[PDB]
A paper describes a structure:
In Drosophila, an RNase III enzyme Dicer-2 (Dcr-2), aided by its cofactor Loquacious-PD (Loqs-PD), has an important role in generating 21 bp siRNA duplexes from long double-stranded RNAs (dsRNAs). ATP hydrolysis by the helicase domain of Dcr-2 is critical to the successful processing of a long dsRNA into consecutive siRNA duplexes. Here six cryo-electron microscopy (cryo-EM) structures of Drosophila Dcr-2–Loqs-PD in apo and in complex with dsRNA substrate in the absence or in the presence of ATP were captured, illuminating the continuous conformational changes of Dcr-2–Loqs-PD after binding to dsRNA and translocating until forming the active dicing state and cleaving the dsRNA substrate into an siRNA duplex in the post-dicing state. Loqs-PD is a cofactor protein that comprises two dsRBDs that are responsible for recruiting siRNA precursor substrates for Dcr-2.
From such an enzymatically active sample, we were able to capture a complex structure in the post-dicing state at a relatively lower resolution (4.6 Å). In this structure, a clear breakage of the dsRNA after the dicing near to the catalytic centre was observed and exactly 21 bp away from the PAZ-domain-binding terminus. The cleavage of dsRNA disrupts the binding site for the C-terminal dsRBD in the active dicing state, and probably results in the dsRBD becoming more flexible and losing its density in the averaged EM map of the post-dicing state, which may be also favourable to the release of cleaved siRNA products. The remaining dsRNA duplex bound by the helicase domain also returns to a conformation similar to the early-translocation state, which enables the translocation of Dcr-2–Loqs-PD to enter the next processing cycle.
Author numbering:
A (entry chain B): 344 to 359
B (entry chain A): 2 to 1040, 1169 to 1552, 1602 to 1654
Write the structure that this text describes.
Amino acid sequence: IDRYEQVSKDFEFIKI
Amino acid sequence: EDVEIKPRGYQLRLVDHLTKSNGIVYLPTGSGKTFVAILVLKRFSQDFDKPIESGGKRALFMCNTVELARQQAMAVRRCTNFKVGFYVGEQGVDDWTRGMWSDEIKKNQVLVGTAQVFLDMVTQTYVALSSLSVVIIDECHHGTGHHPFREFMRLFTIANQTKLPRVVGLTGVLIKGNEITNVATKLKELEITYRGNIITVSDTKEMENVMLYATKPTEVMVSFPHQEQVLTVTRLISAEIEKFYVSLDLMNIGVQPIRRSKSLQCLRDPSKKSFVKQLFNDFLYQMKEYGIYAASIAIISLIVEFDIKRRQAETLSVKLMHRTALTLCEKIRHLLVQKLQDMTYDDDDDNVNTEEVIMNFSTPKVQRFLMSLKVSFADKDPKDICCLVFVERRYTCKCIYGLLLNYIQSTPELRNVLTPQFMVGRNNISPDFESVLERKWQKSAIQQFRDGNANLMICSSVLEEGIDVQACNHVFILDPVKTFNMYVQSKGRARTTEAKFVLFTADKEREKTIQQIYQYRKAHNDIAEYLKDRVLEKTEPELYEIKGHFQDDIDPFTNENGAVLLPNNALAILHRYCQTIPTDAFGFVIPWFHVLQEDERDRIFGVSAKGKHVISINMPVNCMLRDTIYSDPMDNVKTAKISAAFKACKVLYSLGELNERFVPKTLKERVASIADVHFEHWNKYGDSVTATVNKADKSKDRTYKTECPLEFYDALPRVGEICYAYEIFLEPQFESCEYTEHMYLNLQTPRNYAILLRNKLPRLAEMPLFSNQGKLHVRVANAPLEVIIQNSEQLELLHQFHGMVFRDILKIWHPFFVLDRRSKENSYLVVPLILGAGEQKCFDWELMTNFRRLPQSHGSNVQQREQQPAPRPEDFEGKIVTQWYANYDKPMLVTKVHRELTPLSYMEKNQQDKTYYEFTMSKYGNRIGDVVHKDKFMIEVRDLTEQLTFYVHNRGKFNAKSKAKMKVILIPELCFNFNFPGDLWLKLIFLPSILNRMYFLLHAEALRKRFNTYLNLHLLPFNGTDYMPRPLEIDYSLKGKVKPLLILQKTVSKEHITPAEQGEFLAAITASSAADVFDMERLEILGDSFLKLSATLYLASKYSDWNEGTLTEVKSKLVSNRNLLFCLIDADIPKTLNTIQFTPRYTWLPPGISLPHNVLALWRENPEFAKIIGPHNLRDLALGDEESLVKGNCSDINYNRFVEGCRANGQSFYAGADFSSEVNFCVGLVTIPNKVIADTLEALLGVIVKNYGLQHAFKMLEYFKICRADIDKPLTQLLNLELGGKKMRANVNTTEIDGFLINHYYLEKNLGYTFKDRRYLLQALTHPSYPTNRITGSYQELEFIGDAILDFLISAYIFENNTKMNPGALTDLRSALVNNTTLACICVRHRLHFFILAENAKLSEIISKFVNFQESQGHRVTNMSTNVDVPKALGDVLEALIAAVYLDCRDLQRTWEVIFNLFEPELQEFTRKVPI
RNA sequence: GAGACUUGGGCAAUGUGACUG
RNA sequence: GUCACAUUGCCCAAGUCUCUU
RNA sequence: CAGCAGUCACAUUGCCCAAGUCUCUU
RNA sequence: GAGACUUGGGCAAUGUGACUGCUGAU
């Protein structure tokens, strides 16, 4: 693998 | 603190119910459960100050951790009026005694401490359990299993089951573990544990306002992808990582102890080999989990930790492996940084480039962590940020910290607001990254967080329980939640309002995490359902519950005084006891455990134990029991192990072994051993090893009685016996001058006085007697003249002659004396001898037949002198006269006769133009009418001295008496004449000074014979011997190769043994107070030094399994003056010692004369009249002449007088007065202080070592039962006394020597003694700080014996080579020659500091600065500029190296040669001015 | 040769201070 | 192990008186 | 007595991973 | 797989004691 896979900036602090 | 401590709405009823019965409270953290515990103490504060023995009580506050112990100590000190005892291990508790514990209990009304401390306090029964009013239990949810809370709670059943202390349980979470299903099955375990009901606040809704202080935070979660993608470089680095694992498996490190799995399955690698494996496994886990940039700092941690491990490595083999690991870690760092630098070609913005490289190489989980923190903070105020971040592992904490610093620095929005911190549990990792271990930061990270310096808190599970922290505004759980209690307490750590709880979860494991969180929610909601649904009933009568719960394990053991041994605690005490054994080079100090094979169960206990495991315990090679003990049949390996340990402890204690207090068993008693192996004879005198006296000079001045010598007892002759007469020779030393004519001529005359003895005498050497004219040498006749008492009247006449001589001619008499013929103590007669037939002298019976009554001087009148015949001129030549007209009765010695002078005499200097007749008429004409015989005769006379104690050396000086003295002439008829010749009178004056040396000379001869018989010296020079005359102790203040020492030369050869001169023994007898020319004091120093050397060597040889401290503290009592006094008293010596200064006129009893026998009987046999009669009563016994010289007893009037003397003393102010000081000499009693008896003991030792050498002196020391003989072999020589072991010798072979001895020939080139065994040298050069001390020891043991060796050698050299120095300056210079500073100067001059092996911070610089100072000062001995500290180690290095040199050949001559070669300049420089 | 007597010097046994190992 | 300062005893230097003519 | 630091053994609670045994469901 | 139990490596927290090493003051 050349490099890691970037992840999306946006998300949600979903209630658990 | 404050008055706002008014209780919350719930605590009052809680403490109310806690009084009725045992209770446990379940409230969330931050609700003041500590305060309600303090309230419980307040309610139960009735009986605190009263002592236990009077019925008083106290309380006990149980704790879990030392940090929480300090926290609760602060919490109880802030708002209580009692006194609290902060008890923590590793100090005090293991060294305290019952007195200190009880005294602390007397003052402290409540105590706080960890669980095991209270376990040891209670099981060992320092105080009764009933002495505690209440017991406070923190973290009661741990009260299950083998945890110490349950172990202590077990003690309640076996103890007195009445008036039991109250127990209260406090916990934020009630259940620990994942067995949360059917929680009622878990609550009842803790309930029956404390036999108390669980209680929770019923008004939760109304009291939730207080719970706002512990508000439930909002619960959110972040999901991240967990794709299984890994970079190439990881697969590369793993290859050499596993290669290093394989290579380390092939390492050649030294031997290691037994290590294997918990259940004793196949072996496991040692700690020094598996620690690096574990560290690399953790590093790989971190790298895989958190990303490459995380590894970029994890690797730095690995290097900075392997560097510390290398620095702390003792063996050289470990250093190479750590260097290889360090190189591999450097390579890993190189690859990581190479990957990072191969990335980051896109942009030149260094801050943005660093931020984007942190974002990129980070794993998606850590990336989500980063952006979640960024969006949570978003450059808000620092005071708004207060949170805890919980991860799993310690290196995880450190790595996350290291990457978070870089991430914060890479973002200006977070640079000024985030200040992270980290700390972990007991595995204390260094909190620094770029520096070696040199940090000293007293304030812990918790204190730093409390100060507000740090805002973001990274922490492991250490902060989940117990520690109270500010109410943080956020909680981020980076790692997945795994346990219910951890989740509950983590959610409770967001204790403030508006707090946020953030959990990070994987995308592909999100559903199971949600399910698990929901399960925890249901469990937490169901925790309170058991108490809510509980039927309202007490928790008391079910004792069977506790009995069954506590009887499942192994039953305990109890004995007298209430001491109880916990079976679960047997392993610790067994290991502690087995660690006290003297280890070998690689001896194992732990029991060896070996489970028996399958078919070996029935070989011991039978077929009944097929499934029940049985294991044997193997004792170490130096245990008290060398056999093995087998376990009872148990269903599991761990229970079998604990049962075996418990049985081994029981067996050890049943022998006296296993310390009663259940301890490694061994202390002051080790001493007791040797002690009584020695001080056993103290008990018969009222003393013991533990008894000391420091008041009223008790056991310091003791009364002793004296016995006559063996040759004067029953020496009185009788009728029809062969009597022996030894004449006395007086040789004049002073020249014949005008002032010394008479003292020469009349003292050289043949007429002498001699002693009549019924026994034989040895040959007595000549001694000097100092008189006014000079010195006189006296010698006794070697061969006596045999005579026989042929008639009773002859013996009576001789005894009367003796009595009247002692009564008159010397005036040494007292009114109460009686002429003694019955008592045989020091009884003999003195008689004069004259030529009767040939050269041999027979009895001068003319003297005895005339001088029964001495001529009484009387006045003669003119009529009497007219009738008196004219005296012939020869009637006065040599006779004694005295003037009767004068009141003086003093005798007058005739010097010159006058046949050519007339009473109308010639002129004189004073009475010029005057005659003696005119002078006598003018001066004494009142009592002379006229001189009738006034023609043809006068006499020239000179007086004689009155002094008797002719011991003073300088009393005989004549420098100022050389001046002119008048010539005195008397008229004959006016002075009364004695027929006694002054020839015998002049010699007879010296008699007491003869007898008071003859006494102690016979005593010294007896002692010499005893000490020559016990040491079997009966050779030629000891039977036909000739004794050298008396020597003079001048130092009594009364006016290249080496020369072999004379003290040791008579040890390997017998020709050099000088015969023990009687003068030496006499000097050893005479104390300082005797006021004589010789003394014991000089020999005392040498004797003491020899005693010290012998004691140290003997103790270090018999007890090679002890430490130098115990050896010193035992030889102190062995050599103490208290021991020597009792030893010599046991030797019954004191009857033969010379202390008093010979006061003859008052205290020296005459030999054949003593006070009446009835007085002796009724005043010595009666204890009620032992010392009630004083000298004032004795002097009144002026008995009659027949009542004193023939009858031998007192009359009735004198009987009443001396029987009422004591009563009159008891009826006057004389009552209670001391009648023992020099007035108890009648029975021969003498008062001598212990400093005399001891000093005489080592004086005899010094004489013996001087005359017979070291070997015979050490052999004689055995006679005094101080150096007790060994049972296996009685004893051996002082040399070749085989001593050594695992502390005086290196425990490595010759191959490992050179690895510790970099240079040996370069030390040889200056020392000069080629070692044949370098182990002693290595042990002497091994400093305690060196890492080898844990397996090999230190140089202290060799230093201890080298000190004594050097001390004795220097003392002997300064003794023998300087004959006229008072012990003072002599041993004073010794101290200058044995001082630590001059030893350091010797060490630095000979450059021994190169080879000294040590590892310490100051010590590294002190030696260098001191050697530089000495080189700059030119090796100038201080015995200084800018107070430079002396390296006291170097002196101890020399003190151990001297012993190492000695032990390599066991010869003292080579040791002294080496010492002289070392010390040659100092023994020539110090002797001049002896710098003090 | 001895005592009486004072000035100072020298030596050894008790109390304090301090040094060496 | 040894030294310095305050208390008894011994032996001297100075000088004095008494005793021995 | 106090501060700081080093080495090593043993003890307890809980936790996941792998393997195996029995009861038991399938 | 549930339940009973065990083995082994692994993780975190807790605690004891032994050994020696500093530094300052008494």
